[PDB]
Design an enzyme around this catalytic site. Structure first.
Site, PDB file in Angstrom:
ATOM      1  N   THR F   1      -8.088   9.573   3.380  1.00  0.00           N
ATOM      2  CA  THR F   1      -7.975  10.584   4.423  1.00  0.00           C
ATOM      3  C   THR F   1      -9.239  11.430   4.497  1.00  0.00           C
ATOM      4  O   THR F   1      -9.707  11.952   3.490  1.00  0.00           O
ATOM      5  CB  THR F   1      -6.757  11.501   4.191  1.00  0.00           C
ATOM      6  N   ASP F  17      -9.588  10.870  10.429  1.00  0.00           N
ATOM      7  CA  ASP F  17      -9.374   9.432  10.465  1.00  0.00           C
ATOM      8  C   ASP F  17      -7.898   9.146  10.723  1.00  0.00           C
ATOM      9  O   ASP F  17      -7.042  10.023  10.598  1.00  0.00           O
ATOM     10  CB  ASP F  17      -9.828   8.780   9.159  1.00  0.00           C
ATOM     11  N   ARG F  19      -6.010   6.418   9.350  1.00  0.00           N
ATOM     12  CA  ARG F  19      -5.440   5.458   8.412  1.00  0.00           C
ATOM     13  C   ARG F  19      -4.525   6.171   7.427  1.00  0.00           C
ATOM     14  O   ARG F  19      -4.911   7.185   6.836  1.00  0.00           O
ATOM     15  CB  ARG F  19      -6.528   4.703   7.648  1.00  0.00           C
ATOM     16  N   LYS F  33      -3.317  12.754  12.514  1.00  0.00           N
ATOM     17  CA  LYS F  33      -3.433  13.744  11.453  1.00  0.00           C
ATOM     18  C   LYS F  33      -3.850  15.116  11.965  1.00  0.00           C
ATOM     19  O   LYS F  33      -4.085  16.021  11.159  1.00  0.00           O
ATOM     20  CB  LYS F  33      -4.414  13.257  10.385  1.00  0.00           C
ATOM     21  N   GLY F  47      -2.544  15.868   1.765  1.00  0.00           N
ATOM     22  CA  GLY F  47      -1.565  16.064   0.713  1.00  0.00           C
ATOM     23  C   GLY F  47      -0.269  15.333   0.985  1.00  0.00           C
ATOM     24  O   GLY F  47      -0.273  14.272   1.616  1.00  0.00           O
ATOM     25  N   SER F 129      -9.621  12.623   0.595  1.00  0.00           N
ATOM     26  CA  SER F 129     -10.346  11.812  -0.375  1.00  0.00           C
ATOM     27  C   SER F 129     -11.760  11.484   0.084  1.00  0.00           C
ATOM     28  O   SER F 129     -12.611  11.168  -0.754  1.00  0.00           O
ATOM     29  CB  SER F 129      -9.581  10.520  -0.657  1.00  0.00           C
ATOM     30  N   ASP F 166     -15.094   5.883   1.765  1.00  0.00           N
ATOM     31  CA  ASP F 166     -13.868   6.138   1.025  1.00  0.00           C
ATOM     32  C   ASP F 166     -12.863   5.033   1.316  1.00  0.00           C
ATOM     33  O   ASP F 166     -12.694   4.622   2.468  1.00  0.00           O
ATOM     34  CB  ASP F 166     -13.277   7.506   1.385  1.00  0.00           C
ATOM     35  N   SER F 169      -9.771   6.085   3.620  1.00  0.00           N
ATOM     36  CA  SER F 169     -10.007   6.389   5.021  1.00  0.00           C
ATOM     37  C   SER F 169     -10.432   5.130   5.762  1.00  0.00           C
ATOM     38  O   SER F 169     -10.995   4.203   5.173  1.00  0.00           O
ATOM     39  CB  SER F 169     -11.080   7.470   5.186  1.00  0.00           C
TER      40      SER F 169
END
Lengths: 202, 204, 241, 233, 245, 220, 250, 238
Positions: F1, F17, F19, F33, F47, F129, F166, F169
């Site tokens: 994320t 993102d 995902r 999101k 979270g 992340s 990452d 993501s």
């Protein structure tokens, strides 16, 4: 985190670094750790950010209501007492070391330390945070009675610069606040404005 | 670990004007099978179904409490529930137990009333909804189901192709899972009819 | 008819008659007076001796609400004692919370709000007492407040509560208290108490005197026996001509 | 001080079987300012009179027509503070419904919940019934709704109705003038005429308050639009 | 349904009369006038002023404690009319509501929101039969960033509204008529003109020439939004300016 | 994320993102999101996803009630205070971390809120992340008082760095642009990733599956 | 506090509860609700007291409320109290279904609501609910059933009963005309139409003034439906035709 | 009238009638006398018997080793008050390991008895107590009232026909102070006998004596321990 409050004749000088860390990652490098509780009362926050923020908000609320009720400027001792009561009643649930500094018509400049646990003591000067350990000897050997406001500002800036140089949890910019009868003067030291001490080599 | 206590696998797939929901039939305790006709898919309306994978007791409890709330809602509102509204209701029911969570991951498949637009969604054990456009899977063999569905799913499938796709995906996914299987039941929800089929599957 | 049975009921004129009846009960009690001077507050109570069997100092109407705060009461003595307990609790809680002695104005406001809370419902009864609060501090000076059964609180230079408060007010108005000291104010209060007392109506009384100020170092206490005897002698000689 | 309330009902049955407190609340409603609601083919119009007793009042500070959601509006007749309490409760109920179902509450459900609250106050202990009748409009499922909730907690679905002073004459006027397939502008004209039927004095763009509900949602009509409608009438 | 009809306990508790009225609320309105004082509030283009008469019958009363002007926040001030203890309790409630609003929402409460909250509390008192309504009237004074000066008045009935000018007390009808006449003849009102309008309204409805100690003036202005109480010197200057013309 | 936001010269740009992963498996390739709070306030979440959803929904409902009562546009400080008090009184058991941005009468404001109840008011924030890659992009290229297009490009670059560096993501980039005069909910804003085209065909035909029993119910 | 108490739950010198009798008077002032039990079903026939040309069309029914998949109820009395009681009835039915995974028998639901009514009539200091209810339903134990409940909490099973306005005349008509064991739904509908016609003497019978709902079993399912306007019009036309035939034949 | 049924209703004269009725309840009880010397406090109570075959009702109760009381009025109210006082004394001895001062106990009693006089649905305590105690301040005689008011007394009598006893105590208060234990008890007995009609005489059946002092814990003499105190009492002077 390094926080510092020094008392001079007309009032107090407060100082803090601006680094907030989550492990070894700096989440906020321009943090403002000097919190105005009233017009002439500030607080320095160390420890858990959420705990200190909540306690400062609650003390601001209570002190504002108290000052409105009494129609009188609040005492620095009263703000320190509210902080102490909140930090002692919840000493198992909170992680908050507070420095309360301000000016009073009845008492002048005042520095109160409320460390973790919830004790309250008035001091000529106070230092807190993880970076305060590295500057204990410096403030012990450097502080003297009768310093003016400018000398207090220079002393606080020097001590904060040394602590930020040595402590990994301290850094960023130096935020200074001088409180007296006329009002509160705030300034930010950054870049070359921060005191420099040359690294010993060879 | 708690979710793998009883096994199970639920899958929902979207067609052009239809939805499919499938589940395995095995009921077992750890590595021992008890029955081979456990119900995991429950009707929540004429063209609305919910499939529950996880703890069997929590499956039954959530299904019964959801039927309670849905019956009250339909008696009060005087209408049938929309699948998105049902998803929100399930999310609320699961989040009410946020600190005492039910060990179920619901899967919702249905056609929107008065529009018959296919709807599929899945929720975690505390009620986070995930509305997708192709497929949603839940149970102990989610990786195998994901592989099968990502390989086989196509947009705008007719009900026959949708049935074949979901059947092959579920069969080949539960053929590679120890605590899932003992039969597969598939519901195909159209505008005018609902087809329920049990598949010829392995019983080992 | 029936508009005067509850404190939660207004009269057609817009009056709460239960509070007025409590004030009437206050008006039936003996007179207590309090005078603020430039360096303190002096309290004087005309404590009636109903029976000669009672000990001296029985049913005292002067209380120490705090180290620096005194209380002079009139009306129902049990209600006055409950209100003194309330004031003591308020002062103790203020010191516990904010870490310093409660200002007299704030304490008066808190106790007045507590009293006013009993003038609103049918479940409770308005207090049948009125009282004065006196205090002295270096930062705040001399302060004197009075609270009536309705919950109204005002600051005063000289206050009288009880059976004869208009005559006591007339006697007090002849005093230039803004420049006097507690030493002279004690004698003046004794003289006023002896003047307003009714010998024919009341058989006998004790003169209860207390003060707070610089002469007591900011502590409320009973006026010392020497000063009390001198004040009583001066009052008796002033009554005589 | 004692925070306990009365635990016995203040509304009780009479020998004739009538709850006279509800009838007296209805009388209080009938003494209120006129209010008109008209359900048109493509929307609902809520209209009311707000004539202050003096020009010292601020016409733009207190609103008699209030939004509950983006698609539901309110107007009342009777006692203003009671209306404020019911508006707060209706907004809270609608927000709770949205929190549970994540879709805007239908007008009928909100009307039912508000009527339940009014019944609770009509039966619970130590309280009097509300002295207001509510006119509730809404747009749901591509269809307009108009409801009236009385102090007793009973609600009715209306094509057109009037409340407050001269509400019987207003009802007769609406019967004469109302028809189905009415457009929203004609409904607004008819509502303003119904208000004029009993209005005392001169009706301006500040003496009356108009709110409309349609597919775009519910909104109060600004004084400029009310002035335009009055000039067009 | 007839005028003045009564049934049961409608004169003693807050229940409806056959006509649909609540007599206890009207009795509280009369309790407002039981105080004997009168207050006037006027709104300017950049200021708002409250003036109330200050009566200290005896010299034994410390005049600095007999105040009907209170500050709720730094920027909100109020004038109370009616019963003194009820007024003080309502002032304490308003201060608590404002402080709680600032704590919970992070910005100062608007004057209209505070008036609405006080009116809601007084309505709760009007609906429940176990408690007396407060026989006091509150007029609120403050500056709004978007709209400017605000004058709001709430009554024991639970009713509140904003005003260009308003009055409360024994002579509120005459003062409202005088303010109606002044406002109808609309002209630009500066701070001085607003203060003089309020002072002359009070003087003409009381038919007495004012001394600086007989009234109490509090103001908020756009330049200085903090609520302040005028001293005797400033009130004397305003009175002299009024008296010369 | 990866969620990020900046304060530009005239408003707020939020990025995320799309995902969502359950462990090391991608469950949703198009996840929203960025959450509605008020017509002028939006929020990005990280979270516990259910905690974030419920907290944002509750605060949005409370802000709607507050704005209905006051009749004014909601303030970002009100949402921040509500969120931080609610999070603090649960002592971090509600694991919701949020990037809160909006424009009100005081202008554009950006907040980062943590599950324990601590908030920071910053000109740019990152969370998730992939937050460190996006923060690197910001520290490399951010300048104060950017224009709307420059701010959109910077936020897209930060989200792209999070997506491509990452493992948590991926997928698309969603942008929310908030100013005092308009609100732009761009979903998707960029599509840097797509499924590879088929090289062949799978066997899936009618009659391939054996059926034991079949029941058909006709819906009238 | 004691002075303002009405004492709604105290006995009278003759052993009567005055509030209950006054609520029953309120019931008698309400609209007529009629229920007839047949061999193949059971019906409800209520009088529409909410009539006005400016009233909107009802959603499902003004006075007939579905309680669960197998039961329906009709109410006479205070409308909002009826709403409360119907919500409580639905809650009780759903609670029983949750506990046992079977539909609740009708008498148990009636008993639960009557227990609530009795609890209100015995303690609490609150006024009783001014609602009388008619219950129709089907269950596996006793088949088609018809129940009536009073504000006092008293209930009972019936073959044909009426509540509301002119209920005594309707009861006499049903006593004269109801045939035990021989009733079909068609004959029951005809009897309901004639009883509503005679009882509602002030207003001539029309499909816009009455609401009719029937309960039947169709292949293992319970069907609760409300008769459309054309169906009620046909019923009224048949009743008028029979009345005219009787007039000619007399 | 309409002001005499509730304790929360003031009268137009500024009085509460329920409190006065509870004072009448106190006046209905049998007379008891309390008096103190420099070193002792004595309670003498005139017990009453319902019938010739009934034992005389207890009037003097143990509260603590240094405190005893004599009751007049409602006996259940007296037992409630005695239990409250016993609990307060036990709490004092548990927390501070010292006897509770008598004045502070009397203040607690007054505070407890004031509350029912201001709340709707409560009633005043219909009992009046004479409290005899000894502490660091010496002996104490206290009198409590249903009005929640209490008095510090040199001597006191409450109950039926207590005015004559009060007159005798008024006469001999000047010499009450220097009397020894026997003289003080005889003075109290004469005061109590002043309440009795001429045909009635003090005997060992209707006399109860409670004594507390510097070196003497609170003790009650009831039937045969009373005879030494009764012996020496002269005939009624008429």
């Amino acid at each position: 985190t390094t926080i510092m409050a020094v008392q001079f004749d007309g009032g107090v000088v407060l100082g803090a670094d601006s680094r907030t860390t989550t492990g070894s990652y700096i989440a906020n490098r321009v943090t403002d750790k000097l919190t105005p509780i009233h017009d002439r009362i500030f607080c320095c926050r160390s420890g858990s950010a959420a705990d200190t923020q909540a306690v400062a908000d609650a003390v601001t609320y209570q002190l504002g209501f108290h000052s409105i009720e009494l129609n009188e400027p609040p005492l620095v001792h009263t703000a320190a007492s509210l902080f102490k009561e909140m930090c002692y009643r919840y000493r198992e649930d909170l992680m908050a070391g507070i420095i309360i500094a301000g000016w009073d018509p009845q008492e002048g400049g005042q520095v109160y330390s409320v460390p973790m646990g919830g004790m309250m003591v008035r001091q000529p000067f106070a230092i807190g945070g993880s970076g305060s350990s590295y500057i204990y000897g410096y403030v012990d050997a450097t502080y003297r009675e009768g310093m003016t406001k400018e000398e207090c500002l220079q002393f606080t800036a020097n001590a904060l610069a040394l602590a930020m140089e040595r402590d990994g949890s301290s850094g960023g910019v130096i935020r200074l606040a001088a409180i007296a009868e006329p009002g509160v003067e705030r300034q930010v030291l950054l870049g070359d404005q921060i005191p420099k001490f040359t690294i010993a080599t060879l | 670990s708690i979710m793998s206590y009883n096994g199970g696998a639920v899958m929902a797939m979207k067609g052009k004007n239809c939805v499919a929901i499938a589940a395995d039939r095995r009921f077992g305790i750890q590595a021992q099978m008890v029955t081979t006709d456990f119900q995991k898919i429950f009707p929540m309306g004429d063209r609305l179904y919910i499939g529950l994978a996880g703890l069997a007791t929590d499956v039954q409890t959530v299904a019964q409490r959801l039927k309670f709330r849905l019956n009250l809602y339909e008696l009060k509102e005087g209408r049938q529930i929309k699948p998105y509204t049902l998803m929100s209701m399930v999310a609320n029911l699961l989040y009410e137990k946020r600190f005492g969570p039910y060990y179920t991951e619901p899967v919702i498949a249905g056609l929107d009333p008065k529009t018959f637009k296919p709807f599929i969604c899945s929720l975690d054990l505390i009620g986070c909804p995930m509305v997708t456009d192709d497929f949603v899977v839940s149970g102990t063999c989610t990786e195998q189901m994901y592989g099968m569905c990502e390989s086989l799913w196509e947009p705008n499938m007719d009900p026959e192709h949708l049935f074949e796709t979901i059947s092959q995906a579920m069969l080949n996914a539960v053929d590679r899972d120890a605590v899932s299987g003992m039969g597969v039941i598939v519901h195909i929800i159209e505008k005018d009819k609902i087809t329920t089929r049990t598949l010829k599957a392995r019983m080992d | 008819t029936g508009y005067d049975l509850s404190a939660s009921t207004f009269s057609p004129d817009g009056r709460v008659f239960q509070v007025e009846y409590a004030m009437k009960a206050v008006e039936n009690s003996s007179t207590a007076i309090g005078i603020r001077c430039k360096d303190g507050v002096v309290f004087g109570v005309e404590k009636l001796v109903l029976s000669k069997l009672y000990e001296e100092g029985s049913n005292k109407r002067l209380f120490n609400v705090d180290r620096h705060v005194g209380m002079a009461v009139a009306g129902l003595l049990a209600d006055a004692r409950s209100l003194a307990d309330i004031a003591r609790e308020e002062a103790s809680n203020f010191r516990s919370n904010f870490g310093y002695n409660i200002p007299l104005k704030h304490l008066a406001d808190r106790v007045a709000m507590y009293v006013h809370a009993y003038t609103l419902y049918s479940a409770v009864r308005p207090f049948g007492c009125s009282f004065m609060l006196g205090s002295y501090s270096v930062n705040d000076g001399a302060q004197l407040y009075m609270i009536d059964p309705s919950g109204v609180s005002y600051g005063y230079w000289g206050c009288a509560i009880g059976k004869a408060r208009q005559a006591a007010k007339t006697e007090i108005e002849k005093l230039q208290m803004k420049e006097m000291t507690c030493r002279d104010v004690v004698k003046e209060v004794a003289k006023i108490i002896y003047i307003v007392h009714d010998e024919v109506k009341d058989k006998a009384f004790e003169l209860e005197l207390s003060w707070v100020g610089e002469i007591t170092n900011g502590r409320h206490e009973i006026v010392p026996k020497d000063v009390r005897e001198e004040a009583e002698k001066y009052a008796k000689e002033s009554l005589k001509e | 001080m004692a925070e306990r309330g009365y635990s016995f009902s203040l509304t009780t049955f009479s020998p004739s079987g009538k709850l006279v407190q509800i009838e007296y609340a209805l009388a209080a409603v009938a003494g209120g300012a006129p209010s008109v609601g008209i359900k048109a083919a493509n929307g609902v119009v809520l209209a009311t009179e707000k004539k202050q007793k003096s020009i010292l009042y601020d016409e733009r500070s207190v609103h008699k027509v209030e939004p509950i959601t983006k698609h539901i509006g309110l107007v009342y007749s009777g006692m203003g503070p009671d209306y404020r309490v019911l508006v707060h409760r209706a907004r809270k109920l609608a927000q709770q419904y949205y929190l549970v179902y994540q879709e805007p509450i239908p007008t009928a459900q909100l009307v039912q919940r508000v009527a339940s609250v009014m019944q609770e106050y009509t039966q619970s202990g130590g309280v009097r019934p509300f002295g207001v009748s509510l006119l509730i409009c809404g747009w749901n499922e591509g269809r307009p709704y108009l409801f009236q909730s009385d102090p007793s907690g009973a609600y009715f679905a209306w094509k057109a109705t009037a409340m407050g002073k001269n509400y019987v004459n207003g009802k007769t006027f609406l019967e004469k003038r109302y028809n189905e397939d009415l457009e929203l502008e004609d409904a607004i004209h008819t509502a303003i005429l119904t208000l004029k039927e009993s209005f005392e004095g001169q009706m301006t763009e500040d003496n009356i308050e108009v709110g409309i509900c349609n597919e775009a949602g519910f909104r109060r009509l600004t004084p400029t639009e009310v002035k335009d409608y009055l000039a067009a009438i | 349904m007839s005028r003045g009809s009564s049934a049961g306990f409608d004169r003693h508790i807050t229940i409806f009369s056959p006509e649909g009225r609540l007599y206890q609320v009207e009795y509280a309105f009369k309790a407002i006038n039981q105080g004997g004082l009168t207050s006037v509030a006027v709104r300017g283009k950049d200021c708002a002023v409250i003036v109330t008469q200050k009566k200290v019958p005896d010299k034994l009363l410390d005049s600095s404690t007999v105040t009907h002007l209170f500050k709720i926040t730094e920027n909100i001030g109020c004038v109370m009319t009616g019963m003194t203890a009820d007024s003080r309790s309502q002032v304490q409630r308003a201060r608590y509501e404002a402080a709680n609003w600032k704590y919970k929402y992070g910005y100062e409460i608007p004057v209209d929101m505070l008036c609405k909250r006080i009116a809601d509390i007084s309505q709760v008192y009007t609906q429940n039969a176990e408690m007396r309504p407060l026989g006091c009237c509150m007029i609120l004074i403050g500056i709004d960033e978007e709209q400017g000066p605000q004058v709001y008045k709430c009554d024991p009935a639970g009713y509140y509204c904003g005003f260009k000018a308003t009055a409360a007390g024994v002579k509120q009808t005459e003062s409202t008529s005088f303010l109606e006449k002044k406002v109808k003849k609309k002209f630009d009102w500066t701070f001085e003109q607003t203060v003089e309008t309020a002072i002359t309204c009070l003087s003409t409805v009381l038919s007495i020439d004012f001394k600086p100690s007989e009234i109490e003036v509090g103001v908020v202005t756009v330049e200085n939004p903090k609520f302040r109480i005028l001293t005797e010197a400033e009130i004397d200057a305003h009175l002299v300016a009024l008296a010369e013309r | 994320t990866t969620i990020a936001g900046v304060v530009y010269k005239d408003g707020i740009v939020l990025g995320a993102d799309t995902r969502a992963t359950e462990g090391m498996v991608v469950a949703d390739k198009n996840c929203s999101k960025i959450h509605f709070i008020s017509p002028n306030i939006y929020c990005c979440g990280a979270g516990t996803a259910a905690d974030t959803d419920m907290t944002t929904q509750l605060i949005s409902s409370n802000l709607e009630l507050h704005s209905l009562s006051t009749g004014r546009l909601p303030r970002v400080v009100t949402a921040n205070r509500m969120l931080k008090q609610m999070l603090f009184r649960y002592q971090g058991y509600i694991g919701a971390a949020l990037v809160l941005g909006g424009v009100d009468v005081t202008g554009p404001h950006l907040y980062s809120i943590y599950p324990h109840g601590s908030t920071d008011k910053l000109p740019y924030v990152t969370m998730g992340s992939g937050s460190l890659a996006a923060m690197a992009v910001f520290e490399d290229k951010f300048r104060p008082d950017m224009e709307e297009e420059e701010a959109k490009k910077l936020v897209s670059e930060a989200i792209a760095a999070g997506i491509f560096n990452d493992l948590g993501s991926g997928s698309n980039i969603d942008l929310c642009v908030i100013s005092k005069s308009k609100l732009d909910f761009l979903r998707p804003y960029s599509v840097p990733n797509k499924k590879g085209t088929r090289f062949g065909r799978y066997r899936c035909e009618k009659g391939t599956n054996a059926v034991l029993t079949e029941k058909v119910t006709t819906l009238e | 506090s004691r002075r303002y108490d009405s004492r709604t739950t105290i006995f009278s010198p003759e052993g009567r509860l005055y509030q209950v009798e006054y609520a029953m008077e309120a019931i008698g002032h309400a609209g007529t609700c009629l229920g007839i039990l047949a061999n193949d079903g059971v019906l409800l026939a209520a009088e529409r007291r909410n009539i006005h040309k400016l009233l909107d069309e009802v959603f499902f029914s003004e006075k007939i409320y579905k309680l669960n998949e197998d039961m329906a109820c009709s109410v006479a009395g205070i409308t909002s109290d009826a709403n409360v009681l119907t919500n409580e009835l639905r809650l009780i039915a759903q609670r029983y279904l949750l506990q046992y995974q079977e539909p609740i028998p009708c008498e148990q639901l009636v008993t639960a609501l009557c227990d609530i009514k009795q609890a209100y009539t015995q303690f609490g200091g609150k006024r009783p609910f001014g609602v009388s209810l008619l219950y129709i339903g089907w269950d596996k134990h006793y088949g088609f059933q018809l129940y009536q409940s009073d504000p006092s909490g008293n209930y009972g099973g019936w073959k044909a009963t009426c509540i509301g306005n002119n209920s005594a005349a309707a009861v006499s008509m049903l006593k004269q005309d109801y045939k035990e064991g021989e009733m079909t739904l068609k004959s029951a509908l005809a009897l309901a139409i004639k009883v509503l016609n005679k009882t509602m003497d002030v207003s001539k019978l029309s499909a816009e003034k009455v609401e009719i709902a029937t309960l039947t079993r169709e292949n293992g399912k319970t069907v609760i439906r409300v008769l459309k306007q054309k169906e009620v019009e046909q019923l009224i036309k048949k009743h008028e035709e029979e009345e005219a035939k009787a007039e000619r034949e007399k | 009238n309409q002001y005499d049924n509730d304790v929360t209703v003031w009268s137009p004269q500024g009085r509460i009638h329920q409190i006065e009725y509870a004072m009448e309840a106190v006046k209905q009880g049998s007379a008891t006398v309390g008096l103190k010397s420099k070193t002792h406090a004595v309670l003498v109570a005139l017990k009453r018997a319902q019938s010739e075959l009934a034992a005389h009702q207890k009037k003097i109760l143990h509260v603590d080793n240094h405190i005893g009381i004599s009751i007049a009025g409602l006996t259940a109210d007296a037992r409630l008050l005695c239990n409250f006082m016993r609990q307060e004394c036990l709490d004092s001895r548990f927390v501070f390991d010292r006897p509770l001062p008598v004045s502070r106990l009397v203040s607690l009693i007054g505070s407890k008895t004031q509350i029912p006089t201001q709340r709707y649905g409560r009633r005043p305590y219909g009992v009046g107590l004479l409290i005899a105690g000894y502490d660091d301040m010496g002996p104490h005689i206290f009198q409590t009232c249903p009005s929640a008011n209490y008095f510090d007394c040199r001597a006191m009598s409450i109950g039926a026909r207590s005015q004559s006893a009060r007159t005798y105590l008024e006469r001999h208060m000047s010499e009450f102070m220097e009397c020894n234990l026997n003289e003080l008890v005889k003075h109290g007995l004469r005061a109590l006998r002043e309440t009795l009609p001429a045909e009635q005489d003090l005997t060992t059946k209707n006399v109860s004596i409670g004594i507390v002092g510097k070196d003497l814990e609170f003790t009650i003499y009831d039937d045969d321990d009373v005879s030494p105190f009764l012996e020496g009492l002269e005939e009624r002077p008429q």
